[model samples]
Target chain A: WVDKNCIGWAKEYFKQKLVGVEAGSVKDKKYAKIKSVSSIEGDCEVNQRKGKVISLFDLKITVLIEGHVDSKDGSALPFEGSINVPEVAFDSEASSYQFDISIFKETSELSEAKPLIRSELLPKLRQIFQQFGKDLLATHGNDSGNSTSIYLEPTFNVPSSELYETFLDKQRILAWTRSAQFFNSGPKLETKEKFELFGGNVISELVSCEKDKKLVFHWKLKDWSAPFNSTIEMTFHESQEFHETKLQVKWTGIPVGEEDRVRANFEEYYVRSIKLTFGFGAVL
Target chain B: KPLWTRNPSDITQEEYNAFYKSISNDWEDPLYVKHFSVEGQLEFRAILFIPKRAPFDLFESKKKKNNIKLYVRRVFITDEAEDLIPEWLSFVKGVVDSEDLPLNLSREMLQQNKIMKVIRKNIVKKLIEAFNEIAEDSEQFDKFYSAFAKNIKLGVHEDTQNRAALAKLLRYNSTKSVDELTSLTDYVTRMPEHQKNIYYITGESLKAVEKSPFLDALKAKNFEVLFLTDPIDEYAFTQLKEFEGKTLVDITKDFELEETDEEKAEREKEIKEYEPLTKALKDILGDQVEKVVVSYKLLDAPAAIRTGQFGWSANMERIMKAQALRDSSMSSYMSSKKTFEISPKSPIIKELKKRVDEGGAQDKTVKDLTNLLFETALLTSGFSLEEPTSFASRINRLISLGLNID
Candidate 1:
């Protein structure tokens, strides 16, 4: 419910357009920010560098507009639509991610404004909002850029005695096929890095690793929360506790105000996935 | 020739869909289709479609009439004969065709037709046969029941003669299901040995039924309780009172439960020494409760209030305010006197006994404790209070005592 900068910039950009030849009334305008985040595992994307690459494909941002084309020529109607931007790219040259300039197009029905939008409004609004994006990016600090780092913080009981064993696969983790599963991914989570759950498709910037103690990935749902692909960190430990394995899953960013729902999903889908991947008693 | 008279296989899928669409004006085809001809002295073809989603306002009396269409000899007639089906089956959208009836007859006289009774049973039978076609398949019945089970439960209350057919379609979420639905027959098949009657608890939802203290003993003894969530369910149980010889028991009422001999011996031994404490509880809850006695309808709970042998159940009392055209006297009539049953083995009861016997009824802690237990019983029993202020102050006082605050 909190308003973001793109909303403020949108109002500013619209105010600039209504300067001189303002004929139509800009009746209503509102902005919607990312409301959720989930991870898409399986097919991962890598950032092509000179030598080695972990993953460069990152999260996306969604901005939707709901307003009326309030023109007196019998053309007053409410319209709501979204504009999408791919994974924000980190520009090594610009020393920041080169954000996409806010763009709006003729929404087929608004085809009447073709000439005016292309010639008059397009170039002017692009630079104005492009600068807004630049300012917005500089302030937020959590963006996962060149950090290809993994931390093995506190470890106690681990199931696998053999080093680098792949116990993260759905079969090993859930221990059953009837447990929660991704339609796009096979029965196993790490038997193969193949899945489209946790919102939608496996984005390109996934760190594909099977032989590791912890599972980490960028996850976001394409719902109102798609833009905030929060990172999930899961570590496993084994014990003589017998019935359950010691595990901890911490979701980073989870896009403010949504920690409760994200925590529940982790219980409903992720936790259950772990339990059935292991047993009903898998402790987390 | 009537369109319904054509063989179901001969009629093209498009034709069936088109005809179904024309009558119900529903965009979707009937997931389960019923087309049959009743050929006797009251010979005519009938087609009934069970819409996947019930039409809006199916419950509102003044709106959405003419759910069952009536036609005589393939000629359009007034769809006014409402007795062809009961009010609870109003969600069923379809048409009844009859030929032996006169077209000139008034809607009232038409309902008085001798064949109408036979036709009424026919449509309900046809509706069941259509469902039975797919009853063997769990998924098909599950989808159908998921959409229309509530309406079928309502039907059990309105139509007594056909409660058997409606009962067959009845389903509800149970304690063992984990959320999925189970049929009465399904529950009966899995019922434990020596369990005398069927157990059920009516509540606001499945979770409510499972977590209720009323279900505690049955749950501990491994008995499943049917979870009835809809408003129609509690009322329907009253009409379908028993199904196939086994009585339908709402454990919340003058609860019918099987108490084993060992449990009986333990209860008697406790009661032998439990008289003075019971007298203390009765004195504390005087006028508010009928009597305070020891009964083990508990596992982790200290007390439960039962409207034993008389009066509407606490579950029924919650919905009793809805019956229209009621006076203050009528409301008071069904507000049955309640008996507070205590589990004597409970440590709280044991503590109260020790405290009361030690002080011999003069202890203020015994009075406060007994009254608090009554109020707790009243709140959980789903009854509204005449004294909300006192309840709050009591809670505040207890919190004060807990924190050592004045």
Candidate 2:
């Protein structure tokens, strides 16, 4: 019921926001007006916070504008165009939503007035959608923060055992990562081993593992909000194709904004370093 | 040690092959191999091998250590002895064992040590002898020269002591050789009694040098000019200076060759007669040329540009400009100001002289024609034009006039 109410609220929202521009309220400057708003359509997904449907809107609108050709050459031209909001991810809990807006001009004369529509009008339209998302979330939503995670699965030519040993050996780790601190408690033991990499920038402790199969560790970055540890799990599988071992890495509990940096670090420092040093993966 | 110390008749080919593979880790058979022991004041045994194929990074390999191992008393000392071979011969891999040197000789001691110098000299002597022996078999020598010609030319420039010996090994394509390479000795021996100096022409390629206007008079006289196409060939000649008492002259220069008294008188008279035209052209061209003069050697071509006695040749200028890392100001200073030499016999020059004589030196058409002639000569003489667009515009204008276009 709340998800359906979001669509009804959004139409009234855009009407109020664009009312002045649509009626030629300002005579001094030329402005665009909305001709019509088509039926707002979307897909619904269940959300635990409420039955919030994670909507991806396929909304379309008609735009009409009256503006001079170029600043140097002036002659008022009336132009009409169709603007499609192809997709927009809408979530109540999402701090930011992304979307693509495309303008399809009806005639060549529309090019003259495109600057007015793109610069003055489109950004306002985007802001309205952004505000509606926040308004919708604030009205009926739990404010529980949303965080991100990273997953990487790069394959190697070596066997599962060799791949497991590559992570275990300190010298091999040092050669690949360039800076690593790995202390083995034992090959098969219940004891936790210390694993701090990249000159202690990344601190980790090998908590649980299975021989030649899986490794579960607690990882923490120096710049995190707290001394909170993210759970990093690695699983190795002996792939039949090319006699390779596919090593799957999963790191959860990443902060909301730190997702990009965490993902890039894993891909560059961890994945690329091992590949280039040991000739495991194809060089990019 | 047994491989090197044994007699030439006693050591089998299989033993040398086995040694090369073991030391160099190259499974392929070597192209050439030699083993010798020097039993003089510096007693040492050495074996040299030229690999069957050139290394992938042959040009860059010069900066790397020579693939030679140094052994003392039949025990391995160091494989990092780059001083064992010259930079040009970095491809020549071998083993050099000295019976006289101490077991615990340090790398610092090997730097400028007296024993090291003797060993280097003897190694060079034996390698030269080996090449000389290989040269006897034309089939094999040609094969070796094709692969290592550039290295030998580099050797001529670098090895001061062995420059003369290295010169004998140098070969080039000539106007008469068609496609075959001729040695300096072969060229010198075939030279007629009248031709005192050995003449050569340098350009970017053999095809360009062959069709050069500068070769007109020399080829007319049946004098074979050596075609120096390689960039290093010109630099190598600079180091050589002369070979076998005959000066290696770059015919591309404005060389005032020997002529009879009658011929000299005729040239002087032509020079005096063309003075007005030459003076006008000098003023017109300004610093573009040192001077304008009547060319006695130019036969078919109307004009040609010549470098001064001590300036970069057209080929050398191209080479220097192509170098990515070079001083811009230095290149400008090194730019050889040209000498515009016109043949008095050509109808174009005769007409140009007539126009200049008739108050046409200051005429726009005559000036454009003169500039056009100069630029055409510049291109034919193996020079890159500075104002190519202007030259193209002038040529287009000439074409329009020729076709009677408005």
Candidate 3:
């Protein structure tokens, strides 16, 4: 899907490379940056040639030349060009379709800046692009076992069995700030059963609730297929030695390709924060 | 020690290809693999295989030997446990390791063990999954079908428990594909929206089934007719009476080809117009057949033969008679007489009707022509005549008459 965040990420990133836009003059520092890259607005054209969903989005960048780049129409500048930034799609059977880039359009300013960008900056950008694909996929390794659990010590220091009751309300648990409004932006999970967060969306159902020992729910992210829903099982085991309760989190039928993101999200939001709000730390 | 023990995706093509030689012992690579591990009440690891060629013994023997090797707590047990696998599925070579099974039990006790029953059920379930995986791949499934289609049909014939599962595994050439196979699930998917029953016809080859008069009505509507060439095909259908709640009905019987009321009304008018010829053919052909009627379903063919609704089709009768296990008493048991349905639109039938009408009932030419048509219909409908010599001589007499060489 084409979105503002992806476009916004590209523009902000390009301006950092440019040093200045048309309105401002780009000063050469100790850095030998021949031309600055700017005016990075982006748009996309979606193509499905085979079964693969290939998204080709181009970042429209205006090249800021050292001396002559700040003209009225910006007509005579020799550093303006556009590049197609390839990114992953919501489709299943993840990549080479993701991180699939088609090259840049050759205008005069782009051609001037292209040689320096190709020799110096392109490989680094490729490295960043490759890593971004990994981030979206979110691959996490498992223990000798299929599950991972964390042990947290609380300020209240509640007992082993009944201590899980304090984490019942979802309002405080899903929040990042004082308000239930997450990131002071999006509504909490309780506002709608079907909602999204981070890069993926999830439709959540509270599967089973056993007073304290276990809580299970069906969590399906929107990037994955509709029918492939995974169950998140949280089993709370009390640790007498550490005086902290051990909460085991195991997800079954994790979306095949995107395990890392799903695991990272649950780890960050539910496991990490839920334990931290009551003051929990590293694993036992 | 084993590599196929890994997840199916993790197990490389080379590992699976090498393992097929180690397990199935066939020179060719195994068509597909089904690897699974269940850690519930019964913890077991199994890897079922589809061989490039299923053992001849699997197809030839009524009592299929237990093919899956048994292991208990990772220790070697026995492979001779006859009751360990479904008799029809005994040819699928694999390893079954169950942590809960007892190794010290006697042969009888091992066969009758409580956990063995649960393990057997799981193995069969896994085998079904394996075959389903094979069925989904067009290239692999075609090879798998060539090797084990008959065994799957036997599963329908013998195993009442897994009839539905076995039916899904069945494949045969239909009007849709020349040499390719279609499963019951595919056939059911291809059925018309309002079609209540699946239809098929049995014969010696595609040519016989194609030329059959029984397919006329079905052909007119463009309904796909399954062409069953194998001897066991009809018998397979007998055991599998219905698939997914829809009955499998042969087209040669009293089955209605589903049509709209207006279409049916239009057909009845045509049948009425040919009522006179139908009555004359019934009288002239006498007790050789039960009824002679003009077919509303036909377009190209002149005539065809069909047995009664519950009676054996001509192909089934021929197959039963040829089987050494069957007796003459069984051949004598097909008590229902045949029905001859002639196409009213056929020019040959119109000419035959005119000749009979001009000369009245007992004309020798009319009688000889009626006999020739019925004999030809019977042969095309997959039946051998009770007395073929006299029919041959009568044919000679007619050709002489046609040439005026008497």
Report DockQ per prediction, comma-separated. Answer: 0.01, 0.02, 0.01
Model 3 chain A: lowest-lDDT 10 consecutive positions: A95-104
> Please, what are the lDDT tens digits per residue for candidate 1 over residues B264-283?
98778888788887887777
- The C-alpha stretches of model 3 lying farther than 4 A from their native spots are A1-284, B1-24, B57-66, B102-109, B188-190, B194-196, B244-246, B258-280, B283-286, B329-331, B355-359
lDDT of 2 by residue, A57-93 (tens): 4333322233333333464444433344544445322
**Top-scoring candidate (TM-score):** 2
Interface RMSD of every candidate? 15.5, 16.4, 34.8
Q: Which clashing pairs does model 2 show?
A: none
The better candidate by TM-score, 1 or 3, is 1
**Regions of candidate 1 where Cα sits further than 4 Å from its true position:** A1-284, B57-65, B105-111, B322-324, B327-330
**Fnat measured on candidate 1:** 0.00
How would the candidate models be sorted by lDDT, starting from the highest? 2, 1, 3
Q: Of 2 and 3, which scores higher on lDDT?
A: 2
Give the Å shift of residue B85 in candidate 1: 2.6
TM-score between model 1 and native: 0.57
